[PDB]
């Protein structure tokens, strides 16, 4: 095929043009994101029971919904939380590769058949089934700088005006309002209600009667009278529209004729459906929208479109309304992608420079400058074909494969030049000969690299999804590189290279390029001499090889593992947790302290703070808060002290002085769709109906046992809330009957006053909004306030709660957890330094095996996936080794020569390990993929050396030692220029310290070390291996 | 305004009509709930009476020849035609008195749209029309959008249905031609190992 | 019994607010009549899998379902693949005039 | 000449065929009843059948 | 999957019209074979359970 | 696969049964499937030997 | 077993094996539906079936 295209350069150019056009089209049309879909598909069922405690929600909603989650395919597991805020969240996690839409529709359909079994209030509030997620593409905050708008005002404005157009913007998948539209709020006065002998039941009945839609009929409807000429619809009672209409609602008429209206017994206003969450931006009231990227959409294009829409919106805003961007990681995504693109461009430029340095021929340097961009464009086209996106993993895969691409181009062009300068053949004949020397080796290398890289695409789980990106990218790039080296590069070599004399090697040249040529000639002579000397004494170096292998194993068994380096993305988080029972105001005090610290002590680094009072993560409530800290541009934050790690450490140390509040600042994970580390997620399961207290005792026992193992387990804690004091009311129904008081009236009064009641809907400015009746805050704060509430009896007398009720204090769970339909407790931990996660899990299982009877356990999250996918990667990489050996045997037509190639694997790996050990890096994903690419390049070099030696031995009469020496002499230069080009190209990644430096250093350090060691060692170990193997088996 | 402008071009557009209904009169009814309470008549009774009489009410199912079918109660037509016909309709009070509607109700006339259309989430009105004889739908579309450009600010336009597809086809034709020419050029260049043959 | 304005405010807008973010959607058109009828037709790009499109719009419609009036919920909100043209019309008449 | 002819050639989507059927839409003023629409429909039917 | 989805989309229109007692017991929509894959029995060898 | 998953779930459940409770399989055709397919594979190997 | 259970006068008792594939069942059997297409009722349909 190389011979076919040497005589048909125009056909090769046409193929290259087609590849370039496909690559350009793919680049234009490809999605762009930071990461692909890594986490397994999950669906969340969210329901709310206003006024209900955790136990009420669990018993009336959570268990009923969980008992009906059957007949759903590919479900991995199910977990659920029920909170004292009245909310239940059920997460159903499905197997990887499950269709998210089908899973969601199946879950929602199974819920639809359970809706009749739920409480009417929960049905009225609505149960939502959504695709589980923990990240937003963007957060658009809206603030008021005048103080004339409250949080509810801004939320209603955003809902009515901003939300719809943003939702309609291209690429937006979902929009979440940081608040709610207005709700009619009826804040009740128990004293005024008592004055008129009224209760919340009367108020609710009146609001339902006087705010309703009533069907009337039609004038002249069908079937009509014979002569009817006019037809008109009859309009009747419709929903109210204003607070004024609600205030005029009539509640009763007195004997003296006076009218009691809703305005008389309650304050009427517009407010929020809920008041649990308070959002502030630099201390100012804030609302906003969390915007999620749509499937297959460009992140950058979607963000730009949203910004353009907001810019078009701003002119119509009320005075004082401002748009802000509290959480914006899009700049980090942009800078990371641009850094990778610059790395590719610099790699191409450095390949050009190295080619000119060695060959000193502009036309020769031009050939790789065409070959490599063509392969990159084809790789983009292939990624588009397979439905991949331009994310961090794929671009770093391209960065890692650039070494193999430049190696292919350099091999072809350098071999043609060497043939031209040794035999003096013209470019066409020289290209034919050189291609005939390397075509079979190129095909064999393609097969070997396929075997090396394909298995990454068959790992299981989220880590499998991560590895598949690199696998597909590198495999496609390698295959296209080989195809281009067999089609386009030979044609360019035969068409563009100028002839070289028989003996012209640059010896007679003047200037720098004469000295360099002479020095390289002498260096090659010395290298060949030393290789012969080594070959005379092979065993001495076999001992050194054994030393290298032993040291490689020693370094490998001592390198810490990880998943992805933490990155400085320009944002981070602070969590505040207050003692049980703490109120919204105390949490706001702590959050104000945090915001002041960030905006005063770190004014040079922190640009803004978005403080959310009401929820953190792993719970929600009045005693929890989260502050989202945004940093200035990395250009404005120079030095180590001004990066996220140092800033967060300083913030944690400063916040350690805050009393009665656990405040911790920390950085985001590399992939925020999952919360992952070298940790484990453990579930303690009630398997025999033991109860909450016995499960708490078992959890405490397990926690103490784990605490007795400091050297194996670290930070083994519960991911939940402890029991909190609760106020228990016992309504003696017998006494209520004796007093002529209905229990329904008692329950309605208490719940509506202290919990709030959603009554019905009204229409404000053409939009449907909710109507809530709740007591005025003044009368629902303390237990004694219960003495201010009365219920009317059948006799008409108004009875106080003290007449038919008693009260006390007990303890109860503010947050109840279930796992797979049983009561559960979640424990988070991690292995101590120097310990694998597998052995930490083993110790946790051993500790749990001694728990009280009826208590089981389970693994969830990443622990579940680790347990499920065990010893899989080594298995199919043993398969890969077998396939590589078979491919090499077929290439060489020998059962033994393959070994001399495979023995090269350690020579590179050692260096990578060294580079990872001295720099203090871990065995993360980037390190492993870089190690694979280094192994591939080393195998390429060894394969070419062995092929040249064997061809000399067979196609010529040359002996073993002479053939090996000539092969290494002929292969020294291309190996050296490839290594130099790749090392110079990855220099910036090793040296980088800016945005994205974690991933860049992870990719670069291992590649640098492996390339250096492989280049140094292989050039005199591959001949040794070949000679030893041929001497033993001949 | 747009319809009048289109009607000013009889030689280019024909049957230019709105695909919708015009605003209709409506009979607004107000039931004085306080007055009804004073007379002892429940509001639910009033609502049920008016709705069942004038619009009809579905009660429950029955079986006709083994098939489940609906049961409807409705006023006879002659007591359901004009507004004054509520003179015969009474609602019983708690004490057994038959209170007429006039005692607790009033009415007025209003105007309202009987059919509201929205396109891509925004209020909209659909217009249908044909090209005049000897003209093509492309010319009619060009004239229609030229006319639409001369409308009050805040009013835009769009093409839907077959018009959307026609605009799409017209938009994508030139790129189709260009890509086809490029593909043929490259195929010839590869097949005949020349650039001169493809260029000629 | 709901007028076009009230059914638009309580039904049509509520549903169509949640109809954003569906794949391969070309356009959306809704009408709200004086009998309380709401018809929302969503047209997708040619070659779109109609079953997947229906599943997606159903997943989005479930979010609006609890926000609709209880009467609308009791009547039932139907989501189904739709066509705008009759395949054929089969009329039935009586040749004796005995049946109305 | 080819460029000039292409620009001046009117565009469309698909030719209209005689499919053996067609439609007639009737719309009366606002408030018109069933029987008035029936009279107009009867007039249309009489025109088509005569 | 699509068959079950369409069947339930049609069934949710009838669900409101069903008797409240039927709704409280729970309507089920399944896509399974008509024959038992297996039968898993449970006994008490000690005779301490009915 | 479903039978294997069911058996694994039952194995998870077993450690928490009350005293005396025991699982039995009065109706399971999977053993027949396994033995039949194994017999056919044995036939293939015997055919190779012959 | 069927021969033995033919002596039970209290009930019809039948012991049987399953086919290779249950759904295909008998190789010569037919399944027939008698439909009441005109609202005849249960009695008339039963008479027609007899
Ligand atoms: C030319 C030929 C080249 C072919 C490719 C060479 C093989 C790959 C070289 C290693 C690159 C991958 C590096 C890596 O990820 O290794 C670590 C990983 C698990 O270790 P980790 O969780 O990172 O923990 C480290 C301990 N602190 O994995 C490991 O610990 C290593 C697992 C073994 C690697 C495969 C080679 C050995 C195969 C036999 C393994 C035995 C078990 C499987 C038996 C299957 C039998 C069919
Ligand atoms: O205000 C909080 C959400 N508001 C919730 C309540 C009020 N009702 C329902 C809504 C803001 O949360 C976030 C803010 C940022 Cl900047 C970044 C992330 Cl990841 C999350």
From Swiss-Prot, chain A:
Keywords: Cell inner membrane, Cell membrane, Membrane, Transmembrane, Transmembrane helix, Transport. InterPro entries: AcrB_DN_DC_subdom, Acrflvin-R, MdtF-like. Induction: Positively regulated by MarA, Rob and SoxS transcriptional regulators (at protein level). It comes from the Bacteria. Pfam families: ACR_tran (PF00873). The chain crosses the membrane at residues 10-28, 337-356, 366-385, 392-413, 439-457, 466-490, 539-555, 872-888, 899-918, 925-943, 973-992, 999-1018. Changing residue 526 to Y: Partially restores chloramphenicol resistance to an AcrZ G30R mutant. Belongs to the resistance-nodulation-cell division (RND) (TC 2.A.6) family. NCBIfam families: 2A0602, PRK15127.1, RND_permease_1. AcrA-AcrB-AcrZ-TolC is a drug efflux protein complex with broad substrate specificity that uses the proton motive force to export substrates. This is Multidrug efflux pump subunit AcrB. The lineage of its organism: Bacteria, Pseudomonadati, Pseudomonadota, Gammaproteobacteria, Enterobacterales.
């Amino acid at each position: 095929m190389p011979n076919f295209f040497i005589d048909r350069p125009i056909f090769a150019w046409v193929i290259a043009i087609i590849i370039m056009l496909a690559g350009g089209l793919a680049i234009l049309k490809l999605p762009v994101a930071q990461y692909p879909t890594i986490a397994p598909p999950a669906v969340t069922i969210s329901a709310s029971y206003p006024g209900a405690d955790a136990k009420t929600v669990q018993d009336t909603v959570t268990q009923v919904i969980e008992q009906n989650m059957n007949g759903i395919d590919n479900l991995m597991y199910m977990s659920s939380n029920s909170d004292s805020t009245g909310t239940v969240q059920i997460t159903l996690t499905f197997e990887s590769g499950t269709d998210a839409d089908i899973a969601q529709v199946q879950v929602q359909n199974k819920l639809q058949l359970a809706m009749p079994l739920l409480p009417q209030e929960v049905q009225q509030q609505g149960v939502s089934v959504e695709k589980s997620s923990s990240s937003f593409l963007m957060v658009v905050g809206v603030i008021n700088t005048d103080g004339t708008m409250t949080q509810e005002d801004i939320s209603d404005y955003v809902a009515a005006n901003m939300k719809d157009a943003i939702s309609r913007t291209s690429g937006v998948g979902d929009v979440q309002l940081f608040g709610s539209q207005y709700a009619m709020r009826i804040w009740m006065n128990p004293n005024e209600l008592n004055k008129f002998q009224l209760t919340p039941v009367d108020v609710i009945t009146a609001i339902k009667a006087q705010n309703a839609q009533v069907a009337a009929g039609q004038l002249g409807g069908t079937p009509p009278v014979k002569g009817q000429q006019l037809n008109a619809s009859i309009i009747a009672q419709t929903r109210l529209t204003s607070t004024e209409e609600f205030g005029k609602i009539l509640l009763k008429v007195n004997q003296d004729g006076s009218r009691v209206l809703l305005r008389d017994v309650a304050k009427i206003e517009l407010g929020g459906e809920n008041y649990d969450i308070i959002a502030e931006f630099n201390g100012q009231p804030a609302s906003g929208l969390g915007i999620k990227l749509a499937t297959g959409a460009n992140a950058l294009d979607t963000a730009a479109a949203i910004r353009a829409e907001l810019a078009k919106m701003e002119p119509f805003f009320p005075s004082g309304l401002k748009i802000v961007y509290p959480y914006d990681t899009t700049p980090f995504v942009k800078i990371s992608i641009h850094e990778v693109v610059k790395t590719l461009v610099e790699a191409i430029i450095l390949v050009f420079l190295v080619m000119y340095l060695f060959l000193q021929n502009f036309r020769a340097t031009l050939i790789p400058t065409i070959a490599v961009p063509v392969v990159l464009l084809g790789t983009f086209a292939v990624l588009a074909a397979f439905g991949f996106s331009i994310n961090t993993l794929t671009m770093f895969g391209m960065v890692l494969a650039i070494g193999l691409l430049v190696d292919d181009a350099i091999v072809v062009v350098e071999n043609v030049e060497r043939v031209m300068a040794e035999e003096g053949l013209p470019p066409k004949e020289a290209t034919r000969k050189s291609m005939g020397q390397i075509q079979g080796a190129l095909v064999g290398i393609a097969m070997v690299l396929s075997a090396v890289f394909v298995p990454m695409a068959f790992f299981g789980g989220s880590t499998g999804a991560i590895y598949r990106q690199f696998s597909i990218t590198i495999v496609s790039a390698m295959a296209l590189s080989v195809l281009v080296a067999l089609i386009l590069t030979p044609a360019l070599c035969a068409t563009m290279l100028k002839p070289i004399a028989k003996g012209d090697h640059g010896e007679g040249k003047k200037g720098f390029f004469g000295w360099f040529n002479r020095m390289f000639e002498k260096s090659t002579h010395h290298y060949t001499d030393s290789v012969g000397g080594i070959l005379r004494s092979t065993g001495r170096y076999l001992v050194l090889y054994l030393i290298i292998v032993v040291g490689m194993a020693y370094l490998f068994v001592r390198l810490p593992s990880s998943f992805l380096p933490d990155e400085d993305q320009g944002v981070f988080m602070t969590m505040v947790q207050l003692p049980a029972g703490a109120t919204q105001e105390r949490t706001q005090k702590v959050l104000n302290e945090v915001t002041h610290y960030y905006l005063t002590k770190e004014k040079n680094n922190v640009e803004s703070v978005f403080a959310v009072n009401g929820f953190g993560f792993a719970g929600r409530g009045q005693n929890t808060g989260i502050a989202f800290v945004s940093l200035k541009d990395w250009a404005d934050r120079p030095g180590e002290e001004n990066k996220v790690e140092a800033i967060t450490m300083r913030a944690t140390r400063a916040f350690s002085q805050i009393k009665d509040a656990m405040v911790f600042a920390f950085n985001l994970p590399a992939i925020v769709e999952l919360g992952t580390a070298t940790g484990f997620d453990f579930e303690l399961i009630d398997q025999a109906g033991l109860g909450h207290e016995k499960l708490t005792q078992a959890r405490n026992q397990l926690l103490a046992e784990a605490a007795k193992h400091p050297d194996m387990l670290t930070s083994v804690r519960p991911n939940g809330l402890e029991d909190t004091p609760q106020f228990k009311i016992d309504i003696d129904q017998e006494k209520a009957q004796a007093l002529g008081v209905s229990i329904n009236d008692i329950n309605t009064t208490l719940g509506a006053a202290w919990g709030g009641s959603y009554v019905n809907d009204f229409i404000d400015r053409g939009r449907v909004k909710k109507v809530y009746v709740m007591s005025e805050a003044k009368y629902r704060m303390l237990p004694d306030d219960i003495g201010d509430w009365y219920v009317r009896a059948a006799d008409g007398q108004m009875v106080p709660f003290s007449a038919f009720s008693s009260s006390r204090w007990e303890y109860g769970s503010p947050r109840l957890e279930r796992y797979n339909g049983l009561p559960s407790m979640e424990i988070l931990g991690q292995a101590a330094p120097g310990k694998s996660t597998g052995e930490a899990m083993e110790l946790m299982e051993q500790l749990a095996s001694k728990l009280p009877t009826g208590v089981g356990y389970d693994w969830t999250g990443m622990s579940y996936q680790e347990r499920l996918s065990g010893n899989q990667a080594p298995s199919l990489y043993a398969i890969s080794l077998i396939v590589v050996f078979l491919c090499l045997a077929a290439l060489y037509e020998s059962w033994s020569i393959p070994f001399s190639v495979m023995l090269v694997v350690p020579l590179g790996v050692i260096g990578a390990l060294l580079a990872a050990t001295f720099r203090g890096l871990t065995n993360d994903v980037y390190f492993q993929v870089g190690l694979l690419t280094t192994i591939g390049l080393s195998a390429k070099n060894a394969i070419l050396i062995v092929e040249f030696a064997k061809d000399l031995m067979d196609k010529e009469g040359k002996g073993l030692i002479e053939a090996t020496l000539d092969a290494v002499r002929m292969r020294l230069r291309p190996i050296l220029m490839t290594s130099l080009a790749f090392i110079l190209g990855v220099m910036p990644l090793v040296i980088s310290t800016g945005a994205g430096s974690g991933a860049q250093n992870a990719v670069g350090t291992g590649v640098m070390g492996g390339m250096v060691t492989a280049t140094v060692l292989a050039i005199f170990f591959v001949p040794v291996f070949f000679v030893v193997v041929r001497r033993r088996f001949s």
